[PDB]
Amino acid sequence: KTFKQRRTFEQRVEDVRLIREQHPTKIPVIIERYKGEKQLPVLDKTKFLVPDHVNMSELIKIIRRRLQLNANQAFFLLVNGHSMVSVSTPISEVYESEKDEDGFLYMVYASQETF
Ligand SMILES: Clc1cccc2[nH]cnc12
Numbered sequence: 001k002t003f004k005q006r007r008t009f010e011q012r013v014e015d016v017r018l019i020r021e022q023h024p025t026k027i028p029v030i031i032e033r034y035k036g037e038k039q040l041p042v043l044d045k046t047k048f049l050v051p052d053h054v055n056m057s058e059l060i061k062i063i064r065r066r067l068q069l070n071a072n073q074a075f076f077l078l079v080n081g082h083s084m085v086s087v088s089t090p091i092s093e094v095y096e097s098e099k100d101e102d103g104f105l106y107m108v109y110a111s112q113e114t115f
């Protein structure tokens with residue numbers, strides 16, 4: 001079901017290395033719905049190339065537009081299993097401190113602050 005489950009560590013690593021080669025200015029992001037989530041829909045894909053100059057505040061807007069949410073639906077985004085300390089941080093910086101050992105940046109969203 002989950003990305004890490006579908007692909008071998010060998011396969012996730014080799015894909016991050018191809019994204020470096022072919023989208024060198026992009027951050028490789030895995031974005032997944034909380035497995036408990038009742039309200040928000042599932043995304044159409046799992047793997048996103050994010051421009052490395054966008055801050056986390058702008059990534060949340062992007063995903064809220066991809067889900068086609070409206071202004072009073074709630075949305076919470078975990079990065080590497082934990083809350084974001086700040087939405088002002090550029091994704092290139094977040095990536096360097098929160099990336100996984102396979103080289104993807106893992107994110108999970110829910111309508112409740114409790115995942
Ligand atoms: Cl949801 C989302 C996050 C980052 C970048 C994206 N491009 C298209 N959709 C995107």
Ligand SMILES: [Cl-]
Nearest residue numbers: 023024025026
């Ligand atoms: Cl690029």
